[model samples]
Target: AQSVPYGVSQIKAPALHSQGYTGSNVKVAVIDSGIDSSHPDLKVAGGASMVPSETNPFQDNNSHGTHVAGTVAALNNSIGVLGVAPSASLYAVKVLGADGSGQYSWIINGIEWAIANNMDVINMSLGGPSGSAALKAAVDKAVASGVVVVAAAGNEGTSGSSSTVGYPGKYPSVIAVGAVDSSNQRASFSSVGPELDVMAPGVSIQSTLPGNKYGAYNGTXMASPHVAGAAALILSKHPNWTNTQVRSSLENTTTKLGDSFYYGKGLINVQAAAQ
Candidate 1:
């Protein structure tokens, strides 16, 4: 598969494949708008709707979640773009409703469901401008249950640092990801703060969309999946590694950004972690 210039491939996939981990059997829960289950690139294992059953959870209301899911495990079928872990299973957890806004209770229910299903990883591409106690408690519960929760630092950038990091991502246990450009520079939209654990390519990233189409979307939301996929790769390789070990390995293997405050450990290097 040809790699996308500013996509996860340039940062991690080659090394992950070399390590003999392609995320097979690993299930990733995407708690977001919804997924196009029929997308050729996505491996739709199954899913649940945190939104009311009256709502349609199969549609990509905002297109954000679908794009994120594509990055983590788009099928390697010589089609549009290859995902970081093409073989990983994806479970759609529709927390955010059609308007891209969901209640705290819905998100909480999604996390609890993910835990009950024994998901290996949960990628949250949505976060609020503020924190909520209920959100933190749910995240804490997921962490305790041995599920690696990955979240997106807000797209407010450095100016919003003090209040930028949103729920789930602001929580200590969740692996918060920021966005970086093709040059590995921090994207202007990437939130910056002590909570930032790593950076990932998020600018103009091409991935699966609804209607069997593909396009590029940019945001820390797009970046979060890169880390999620990398986590899947590591877990697939070292099945015995604890969540802490997997987290530590990714941090230790990162390419250190010169300014820790802006880049955290640095851009995630999937190849290095695999090695």
Candidate 2:
């Protein structure tokens, strides 16, 4: 069998997998760079590009979205790393490009597409320092329509840094994720504030990369998918539950390691939330 990343075990995802809660029937949309659909670990169900210049969302150039998708739904096959919710269907809604930059309008369009297809969860592991009223309204609309929106809290963790948590992670409708190491200590690069909803293993996280390979990465972006995958597991267990219920379950079931402001509800546990 494939080796489950230690972070996944720390969050009790293997326990949930044993209970047959592998995110089957869940629809998760990844709004970021394009994805490489040919990766064996990932099975791309369908996708659309919000980037006007890029017609296909399946082509990954930045590799950020590919890594994020691997963390959320890499196959459970006996080989490389396994995802938190291995059976969940993944949709690539490319908004960012090779430069890893995207406009708020592109993100808003991605969210709108997710809502049109009724995605169960949307993992956005990218952010910008500025917030827009139109972006905020779109996120709020997605949340109100039952999409469990998740985002990275940003990597501006320097002491006395001028930057705060980035949007739409800073937005009220988004579940912002921070990063931690294997020992549950806060990662030095993880941004922290009242907007942080939870922390997850981000340092040296191993997952699928572009070109059918695997590698380690560290960031709040890496941590966001763990929470998103946990959300998928919970949704699989309670298919009829509302988006609020799914979010609350994840936050409430977390293992307390810090304060409400810094860690929000703490590190998530998939087994506790799913079973």
Candidate 3:
């Protein structure tokens, strides 16, 4: 048996796993750097890269995207750590380059691809400070096309003001996620705003890295996938639910912690939503 990261249990994913809801067949497109297809713990169903020079989406130069993918659906194998929805299908849609940056067109292209390919969910753990009409249109199309889009709320948390939430996540159509520590306190680096939808364990979250490795990372980037994986779990249980229904269930079933401005609805309770 493999080890389960604390976030796995923190969200009560094991409860759904025991009920045979492993997110099997749920297609999740990770729109970021890329995924290491050769990682034993991960089974890359298929992918395409929008990076100018990176033709293959399977080779992840920056480990950020791989880490995010692992949190969503790392294999329930004997050697590596388990993910929130261990059996979910993962698709690597590389928009960000190895330098961890990408253009709006690239991200828009990735969103279009996910929409065209019929992905069940899209997890974007990356963001920028500004927003554009074209980028907003792409994300709006993804939501209307039935893709459960989730994104990090950025790491620009402040002890003073608000509206620090990044683009795409700042949009209403996408589910914006924040980060919390093991004790359910907001991570000082987790952005806060009225747009925030939910919080998850992000501080020191352990997951797969490139080249058949594993490590810990901390960010709303890590937190967003927990919601993405939770969405997959809920969809696996109730395949007939609309994307709106899935999003509603998640926001509605959260455990109340503090101000909604900081924690959104609160800490996500996947088991509650699955039931």
Which candidate leads in TM-score? 3
lDDT of 3 by residue, 224-255 (tens): 99999999999999998999999999999999
lDDT of 1: 0.84
Predictions in order: lDDT: 0.84, 0.88, 0.94
TM-score on alpha carbons, each prediction? 0.95, 0.96, 0.99
Which candidate has the highest lDDT of all?
Answer: 3
Q: Which scores better on TM-score, 2 or 3?
A: 3
- Indicate the worst ten consecutive residues by lDDT in candidate 2: 156-165
lDDT of 3 at 27: 96
lDDT of 1 by residue, 109-147 (tens): 999999999999999988888778888888998888888
187 Cα displacement, candidate 2 (Å): 0.4
Ranking by lDDT: 3, 2, 1
Ranked by TM-score from best down, the candidates are: 3, 2, 1
lDDT tens digits by residue: candidate 2, 1-275: 57778788888888888888999989999999978999988998889999988778999988899999989988989877899999999999999988898988898899999999989999999888889899999899999999999999998884462446899899878999988888999888888777888888988998888898888999999999999999999888889899999888888888899766566789888788764
